[PDB]
């Protein structure tokens, strides 16, 4: 068969819907900008080949073989490493306080932009402004120090009232206007996983890949907008001092594992919920490359518009947002819409398509934790199915009121550097060691050929045993020695947040020896005899 | 058009005593912590002059004889070092939405 | 120190139209609002409207929604208040106050002498 372009339209656009996330649109432009642009792109293309793609391919192979969720994949592999799945459930609780709040900030801009007069265009004493210059060159205003744009003033005081909180040690009350905005999101999420029928259908077209093809028109505006020739040069600076000892590779380790999928246990249920594809080496290789390609375009439109800020402020590109945290997307897109001619209508379009692109990473993102826990109470879910799906939403809601307060960005950064960085990286290390150093690559190599019939490459077989556990161990060894301290919104850091940071990073690390110590005294025999009886797989 | 009424009408002159004036905020709160409220002096024949902005900060050039307090509905005014020169009328203004108005105004005379 | 002066007093005909000047310099003109305060002799104060320079926005109190007209000019740094449908109550002292620079919205002691019309 030739398999002409009639399949190519149906296939390639369906890969885009499974690739682009908010980790490719929101996380990646900000993680290039935290450690200096250009210095991140070259460690991005090396860590993805050596550490991202072989772990992206490993979880899809074990999903089609054992046909279970990530809680109960390990019972057919090694029964003492069941706490890895419990480490997935305790990390995914921390993501629901980290990732659902960014959705709550996206729907708030949709409500506050029905007016023909956009609030981003001026700082006209509307809610809380002052020391602001809206017209950069439209009313020949020169730029001075300690000045803020109205695109930043609309964020830093309207939606997230930062000045209410003096720091991380003192948080205010609860904002009534934002807490009712996240309530509408969890209503849609609960009314979407109520049945959960999505394997390969045509809902992937409208939900994800059609908002992406309309998001690419922002790059057309950035070409017309000035400062682009001095803007895109900052993204492509290959020379940087000491990319081996500083510790910017954990910014690459956390970004790749948040964008591709492995680490969060979402791939062990996604490859178990479909059928035998028989093209896993040819589908996941295209998907993992285009996931960096759908993130390269979104990592290119942001620094183009930030060159327009650096041009009319007469400052450096790294001088524009020196201490601005994870809200770089809600400032760059805040200015890039107001400079368009159709600023009123396109603000509704560009933000509503950002909502549907984020919900697909949540409607299918909960598949790694809801489907996986179905294999633990088999005789209970016949009268529990209305309860625990509702119970996990309310539990994640009540765990998210620590960051729906006025000091929101003081908690979102803490759940980014410590809850996503080392915690997902450690679980992905134990997932690779226990499948190769303990379960053995000999049994795993015969399991791939049963579903495919094609032998894995000699370049691939050296990765899961020696190469990929070496890079994951070097980053953790470089993290415990180096101070993880950063700076955010003219606030240095408190010293007690660092000790709090390692407590969150070891909150998932403590669950894995807990289940191993649970298997200590419950088995009889000699101490050397109890171990072999514990690591022996089950019998059907 | 949120209305506002001042609860006294006129006070006497006695040096070193308490003089407080409250405002009506039956449908009025503050949105961003810094309390949206103003105070103004106006001598007879003179244009109005700022006394206390944001109900807690000292005005530009005004000495420490005047200091405001309160949070929410009823707001205070400390005129405990009462001065003979302060024989004027005082006003109260809202700065929330398009509702800018003034109260009835209270003067002071022995 | 920001200079802010006004025009002189003017006479009032029945149902005519007036034009009150408000000149102010030494400050960023298209940065803040401009207040217009109505005060009858003997009565209290009354707010009329506001205007942001650069043809930004005009909000009225409601009593002068079709009776007052505010214009702005970034070149001359002056604003104008066109009144219509004059009566025996409109002849009073009008003020032209500059608003705050930001976070509160107060008056920055930048007031005029009062264009008293009668
Ligand atoms: C004024 C405030 C406006 C707030 C606006 C918020 C955005 C509007 C809601 C967008 C989300 C709902 O949009 C869409 O809804 C449908 C049905 O309702 C869901 O459901 C759809 O997909 C699921 C599986 O994915 C299928 O089982 C289902 O048959 C199909 O209808 C989608 O998953 C969601 O993408
Ligand atoms: C606008 O200007 C004001 C006045 O200079 C700034 O307020 C000061 O900011 C610096 C740091 O930026 C602080 O160290 C000072 O303590 C601030 N002064 C006061 C009295 O608080 C303000 O930060 C500027 N920028 C805005 C409002 O965005
Ligand atoms: C598909 C790509 C995955 C890789 C990162 C983590 C993961 C995940 N799992 C979750 C569990 C619960 C939850 O409640 C709102 C959200 C998530 C998310 C966030 C969306 N993404 C990014 C997925």
mmCIF file of C-alpha atoms in Angstrom, chain A residues 9-248:
data_model
loop_
_atom_site.group_PDB
_atom_site.id
_atom_site.type_symbol
_atom_site.label_atom_id
_atom_site.label_comp_id
_atom_site.label_asym_id
_atom_site.label_seq_id
_atom_site.Cartn_x
_atom_site.Cartn_y
_atom_site.Cartn_z
ATOM 1 C CA UNK A 9 -4.043 14.851 6.955
ATOM 2 C CA UNK A 10 -5.835 12.419 9.276
ATOM 3 C CA UNK A 11 -2.651 11.252 11.027
ATOM 4 C CA UNK A 12 -0.305 14.236 11.428
ATOM 5 C CA UNK A 13 -2.949 16.637 12.750
ATOM 6 C CA UNK A 14 -4.012 13.962 15.253
ATOM 7 C CA UNK A 15 -0.449 13.825 16.610
ATOM 8 C CA UNK A 16 -0.576 17.591 17.285
ATOM 9 C CA UNK A 17 -3.631 17.088 19.502
ATOM 10 C CA UNK A 18 -1.730 14.545 21.613
ATOM 11 C CA UNK A 19 1.456 16.655 21.763
ATOM 12 C CA UNK A 20 0.825 20.298 22.690
ATOM 13 C CA UNK A 21 0.023 21.030 26.348
ATOM 14 C CA UNK A 22 0.347 23.990 28.685
ATOM 15 C CA UNK A 23 3.817 22.605 29.375
ATOM 16 C CA UNK A 24 4.633 23.534 25.768
ATOM 17 C CA UNK A 25 2.974 26.978 25.797
ATOM 18 C CA UNK A 26 3.339 28.271 29.378
ATOM 19 C CA UNK A 27 6.204 26.323 30.990
ATOM 20 C CA UNK A 28 8.771 26.362 28.163
ATOM 21 C CA UNK A 29 9.025 30.132 27.334
ATOM 22 C CA UNK A 30 9.427 30.948 31.012
ATOM 23 C CA UNK A 31 12.076 28.271 31.682
ATOM 24 C CA UNK A 32 14.129 29.591 28.759
ATOM 25 C CA UNK A 33 13.888 33.035 30.364
ATOM 26 C CA UNK A 34 14.691 32.141 33.989
ATOM 27 C CA UNK A 35 18.281 31.024 33.304
ATOM 28 C CA UNK A 36 18.915 33.310 30.331
ATOM 29 C CA UNK A 37 17.678 32.734 26.804
ATOM 30 C CA UNK A 38 19.845 30.742 24.421
ATOM 31 C CA UNK A 39 21.580 28.988 27.317
ATOM 32 C CA UNK A 40 18.597 26.625 27.656
ATOM 33 C CA UNK A 41 18.012 25.521 24.051
ATOM 34 C CA UNK A 42 21.240 23.530 23.662
ATOM 35 C CA UNK A 43 20.761 21.555 26.936
ATOM 36 C CA UNK A 44 17.140 21.047 25.833
ATOM 37 C CA UNK A 45 18.028 19.167 22.635
ATOM 38 C CA UNK A 46 20.536 16.915 24.443
ATOM 39 C CA UNK A 47 18.524 16.022 27.556
ATOM 40 C CA UNK A 48 15.502 15.147 25.396
ATOM 41 C CA UNK A 49 17.445 12.667 23.247
ATOM 42 C CA UNK A 50 19.322 11.060 26.145
ATOM 43 C CA UNK A 51 16.789 11.273 28.979
ATOM 44 C CA UNK A 52 13.373 12.239 27.648
ATOM 45 C CA UNK A 53 12.661 10.037 24.616
ATOM 46 C CA UNK A 54 13.930 6.674 26.060
ATOM 47 C CA UNK A 55 11.704 7.246 29.095
ATOM 48 C CA UNK A 56 8.858 8.355 26.815
ATOM 49 C CA UNK A 57 9.142 5.060 24.913
ATOM 50 C CA UNK A 58 9.529 2.858 28.004
ATOM 51 C CA UNK A 59 6.179 3.660 29.618
ATOM 52 C CA UNK A 60 4.244 3.120 26.385
ATOM 53 C CA UNK A 61 5.779 -0.349 26.023
ATOM 54 C CA UNK A 62 4.736 -1.430 29.526
ATOM 55 C CA UNK A 63 1.254 0.023 29.013
ATOM 56 C CA UNK A 64 0.387 -2.230 26.086
ATOM 57 C CA UNK A 65 1.941 -5.372 27.586
ATOM 58 C CA UNK A 66 0.494 -5.698 31.086
ATOM 59 C CA UNK A 67 -2.738 -3.750 30.296
ATOM 60 C CA UNK A 68 -3.268 -2.151 33.721
ATOM 61 C CA UNK A 69 -2.951 1.201 35.455
ATOM 62 C CA UNK A 70 0.290 2.528 36.933
ATOM 63 C CA UNK A 71 -0.701 1.418 40.437
ATOM 64 C CA UNK A 72 -1.028 -2.175 39.188
ATOM 65 C CA UNK A 73 1.616 -2.337 36.462
ATOM 66 C CA UNK A 74 4.274 -2.982 39.110
ATOM 67 C CA UNK A 75 2.481 -6.003 40.602
ATOM 68 C CA UNK A 76 3.338 -7.915 37.405
ATOM 69 C CA UNK A 77 6.919 -6.546 37.370
ATOM 70 C CA UNK A 78 8.219 -6.172 40.938
ATOM 71 C CA UNK A 79 5.792 -6.184 43.900
ATOM 72 C CA UNK A 80 7.971 -4.152 46.285
ATOM 73 C CA UNK A 81 7.956 -1.107 43.965
ATOM 74 C CA UNK A 82 4.242 -0.409 44.378
ATOM 75 C CA UNK A 83 4.971 2.851 46.222
ATOM 76 C CA UNK A 84 6.120 4.370 42.926
ATOM 77 C CA UNK A 85 2.434 4.463 42.018
ATOM 78 C CA UNK A 86 1.710 5.940 45.437
ATOM 79 C CA UNK A 87 4.431 8.483 44.666
ATOM 80 C CA UNK A 88 2.508 9.315 41.480
ATOM 81 C CA UNK A 89 -0.702 9.957 43.436
ATOM 82 C CA UNK A 90 1.021 12.277 45.926
ATOM 83 C CA UNK A 91 2.762 14.278 43.171
ATOM 84 C CA UNK A 92 -0.452 14.580 41.126
ATOM 85 C CA UNK A 93 -2.141 16.055 44.202
ATOM 86 C CA UNK A 94 0.508 18.803 44.170
ATOM 87 C CA UNK A 95 -0.006 19.438 40.445
ATOM 88 C CA UNK A 96 -3.714 20.129 41.069
ATOM 89 C CA UNK A 97 -2.689 23.057 43.278
ATOM 90 C CA UNK A 98 -0.088 24.081 40.672
ATOM 91 C CA UNK A 99 -1.853 23.548 37.337
ATOM 92 C CA UNK A 100 -5.540 24.256 38.018
ATOM 93 C CA UNK A 101 -4.740 27.774 39.254
ATOM 94 C CA UNK A 102 -3.177 28.712 35.907
ATOM 95 C CA UNK A 103 -6.494 27.710 34.346
ATOM 96 C CA UNK A 104 -8.207 29.978 36.890
ATOM 97 C CA UNK A 105 -6.113 32.931 35.716
ATOM 98 C CA UNK A 106 -6.947 32.175 32.072
ATOM 99 C CA UNK A 107 -10.733 32.299 32.493
ATOM 100 C CA UNK A 108 -10.448 35.566 34.432
ATOM 101 C CA UNK A 109 -8.998 37.427 31.443
ATOM 102 C CA UNK A 110 -11.911 36.125 29.359
ATOM 103 C CA UNK A 111 -14.446 37.698 31.735
ATOM 104 C CA UNK A 112 -12.587 41.027 32.003
ATOM 105 C CA UNK A 113 -12.258 41.580 28.237
ATOM 106 C CA UNK A 114 -15.808 41.951 26.881
ATOM 107 C CA UNK A 115 -15.399 45.743 26.940
ATOM 108 C CA UNK A 116 -14.393 47.371 23.642
ATOM 109 C CA UNK A 117 -11.944 49.512 25.625
ATOM 110 C CA UNK A 118 -9.334 46.948 26.635
ATOM 111 C CA UNK A 119 -7.855 47.417 30.136
ATOM 112 C CA UNK A 120 -4.375 46.466 28.881
ATOM 113 C CA UNK A 121 -4.175 49.514 26.597
ATOM 114 C CA UNK A 122 -3.990 52.094 29.400
ATOM 115 C CA UNK A 123 -3.393 52.543 33.121
ATOM 116 C CA UNK A 124 -6.219 55.055 33.414
ATOM 117 C CA UNK A 125 -6.664 54.870 37.246
ATOM 118 C CA UNK A 126 -9.155 52.062 36.678
ATOM 119 C CA UNK A 127 -8.578 49.625 39.553
ATOM 120 C CA UNK A 128 -5.040 50.137 40.904
ATOM 121 C CA UNK A 129 -2.426 51.868 38.739
ATOM 122 C CA UNK A 130 0.325 54.436 39.243
ATOM 123 C CA UNK A 131 3.920 54.970 38.051
ATOM 124 C CA UNK A 132 2.955 53.668 34.615
ATOM 125 C CA UNK A 133 3.672 54.625 30.992
ATOM 126 C CA UNK A 134 1.148 53.137 28.568
ATOM 127 C CA UNK A 135 2.288 54.854 25.352
ATOM 128 C CA UNK A 136 5.889 53.857 24.664
ATOM 129 C CA UNK A 137 6.319 55.872 21.451
ATOM 130 C CA UNK A 138 2.731 56.981 20.756
ATOM 131 C CA UNK A 139 3.027 60.071 22.990
ATOM 132 C CA UNK A 140 6.892 60.325 22.964
ATOM 133 C CA UNK A 141 7.274 59.201 26.582
ATOM 134 C CA UNK A 142 10.829 58.328 27.562
ATOM 135 C CA UNK A 143 11.481 55.286 29.738
ATOM 136 C CA UNK A 144 12.863 55.711 33.258
ATOM 137 C CA UNK A 145 13.733 53.328 36.062
ATOM 138 C CA UNK A 146 11.148 51.914 38.512
ATOM 139 C CA UNK A 147 8.462 52.050 35.810
ATOM 140 C CA UNK A 148 5.950 49.303 35.025
ATOM 141 C CA UNK A 149 3.864 48.625 31.925
ATOM 142 C CA UNK A 150 0.048 48.466 32.166
ATOM 143 C CA UNK A 151 0.278 44.912 30.806
ATOM 144 C CA UNK A 152 2.085 44.058 34.052
ATOM 145 C CA UNK A 153 -0.021 46.341 36.274
ATOM 146 C CA UNK A 154 -3.186 44.614 35.059
ATOM 147 C CA UNK A 155 -1.705 41.342 36.324
ATOM 148 C CA UNK A 156 0.138 42.303 39.503
ATOM 149 C CA UNK A 157 -2.777 44.056 41.266
ATOM 150 C CA UNK A 158 -6.110 43.121 39.638
ATOM 151 C CA UNK A 159 -6.154 39.330 39.294
ATOM 152 C CA UNK A 160 -3.384 38.448 41.793
ATOM 153 C CA UNK A 161 -3.233 41.048 44.573
ATOM 154 C CA UNK A 162 0.411 40.675 45.574
ATOM 155 C CA UNK A 163 0.668 43.785 47.787
ATOM 156 C CA UNK A 164 -1.915 42.318 50.203
ATOM 157 C CA UNK A 165 0.755 39.792 51.237
ATOM 158 C CA UNK A 166 4.005 41.092 52.710
ATOM 159 C CA UNK A 167 5.720 37.811 51.860
ATOM 160 C CA UNK A 168 5.469 34.050 52.055
ATOM 161 C CA UNK A 169 5.343 34.232 55.864
ATOM 162 C CA UNK A 170 2.189 36.407 55.795
ATOM 163 C CA UNK A 171 -0.731 35.482 53.543
ATOM 164 C CA UNK A 172 -4.005 37.387 53.356
ATOM 165 C CA UNK A 173 -7.556 36.117 53.063
ATOM 166 C CA UNK A 174 -9.235 34.504 50.066
ATOM 167 C CA UNK A 175 -10.110 36.509 46.959
ATOM 168 C CA UNK A 176 -13.822 36.115 46.239
ATOM 169 C CA UNK A 177 -13.540 36.990 42.548
ATOM 170 C CA UNK A 178 -10.938 34.330 41.677
ATOM 171 C CA UNK A 179 -12.241 31.533 43.932
ATOM 172 C CA UNK A 180 -15.579 31.537 42.098
ATOM 173 C CA UNK A 181 -13.650 31.412 38.807
ATOM 174 C CA UNK A 182 -11.951 28.087 39.583
ATOM 175 C CA UNK A 183 -15.323 26.647 40.684
ATOM 176 C CA UNK A 184 -16.610 26.831 37.099
ATOM 177 C CA UNK A 185 -13.557 24.870 35.915
ATOM 178 C CA UNK A 186 -14.042 21.928 38.301
ATOM 179 C CA UNK A 187 -17.702 21.783 37.247
ATOM 180 C CA UNK A 188 -16.590 21.177 33.647
ATOM 181 C CA UNK A 189 -13.922 18.654 34.710
ATOM 182 C CA UNK A 190 -16.398 16.655 36.814
ATOM 183 C CA UNK A 191 -18.908 16.714 33.935
ATOM 184 C CA UNK A 192 -16.251 15.370 31.528
ATOM 185 C CA UNK A 193 -14.668 12.405 33.340
ATOM 186 C CA UNK A 194 -18.155 11.308 34.383
ATOM 187 C CA UNK A 195 -17.985 8.715 31.589
ATOM 188 C CA UNK A 196 -14.577 9.127 29.934
ATOM 189 C CA UNK A 197 -14.905 7.831 26.363
ATOM 190 C CA UNK A 198 -11.860 9.016 24.395
ATOM 191 C CA UNK A 199 -9.567 6.523 22.636
ATOM 192 C CA UNK A 200 -8.902 7.813 19.100
ATOM 193 C CA UNK A 201 -12.076 9.737 18.251
ATOM 194 C CA UNK A 202 -12.688 12.991 16.410
ATOM 195 C CA UNK A 203 -12.910 15.048 19.618
ATOM 196 C CA UNK A 204 -9.109 15.504 19.494
ATOM 197 C CA UNK A 205 -9.571 17.703 16.392
ATOM 198 C CA UNK A 206 -11.726 20.421 17.955
ATOM 199 C CA UNK A 207 -10.289 20.351 21.487
ATOM 200 C CA UNK A 208 -6.526 20.621 20.987
ATOM 201 C CA UNK A 209 -5.089 20.843 17.468
ATOM 202 C CA UNK A 210 -7.566 23.423 16.110
ATOM 203 C CA UNK A 211 -6.743 25.870 18.963
ATOM 204 C CA UNK A 212 -3.079 25.346 18.059
ATOM 205 C CA UNK A 213 -3.473 26.245 14.375
ATOM 206 C CA UNK A 214 -5.216 29.495 15.375
ATOM 207 C CA UNK A 215 -2.565 30.241 18.029
ATOM 208 C CA UNK A 216 0.161 30.343 15.349
ATOM 209 C CA UNK A 217 -1.176 33.661 13.974
ATOM 210 C CA UNK A 218 0.479 35.470 16.901
ATOM 211 C CA UNK A 219 3.804 34.815 15.159
ATOM 212 C CA UNK A 220 2.479 36.765 12.157
ATOM 213 C CA UNK A 221 1.924 39.772 14.437
ATOM 214 C CA UNK A 222 5.405 39.429 15.942
ATOM 215 C CA UNK A 223 6.974 39.696 12.491
ATOM 216 C CA UNK A 224 5.139 42.976 11.863
ATOM 217 C CA UNK A 225 5.856 44.245 15.385
ATOM 218 C CA UNK A 226 9.197 46.078 15.800
ATOM 219 C CA UNK A 227 12.020 44.908 18.020
ATOM 220 C CA UNK A 228 11.887 41.394 16.555
ATOM 221 C CA UNK A 229 15.340 41.576 14.942
ATOM 222 C CA UNK A 230 16.790 42.451 18.354
ATOM 223 C CA UNK A 231 14.323 40.110 20.069
ATOM 224 C CA UNK A 232 14.923 36.706 18.484
ATOM 225 C CA UNK A 233 18.705 37.059 18.823
ATOM 226 C CA UNK A 234 18.388 36.597 22.596
ATOM 227 C CA UNK A 235 16.747 33.197 22.042
ATOM 228 C CA UNK A 236 19.713 31.987 19.966
ATOM 229 C CA UNK A 237 22.821 32.770 22.034
ATOM 230 C CA UNK A 238 24.766 29.470 22.204
ATOM 231 C CA UNK A 239 27.658 30.684 24.364
ATOM 232 C CA UNK A 240 27.148 30.602 28.132
ATOM 233 C CA UNK A 241 29.525 30.235 31.065
ATOM 234 C CA UNK A 242 29.601 26.930 33.009
ATOM 235 C CA UNK A 243 26.636 24.919 31.767
ATOM 236 C CA UNK A 244 28.164 21.854 33.491
ATOM 237 C CA UNK A 245 28.328 22.847 37.177
ATOM 238 C CA UNK A 246 25.717 25.616 37.638
ATOM 239 C CA UNK A 247 22.592 23.463 37.716
ATOM 240 C CA UNK A 248 20.464 24.608 34.779
#
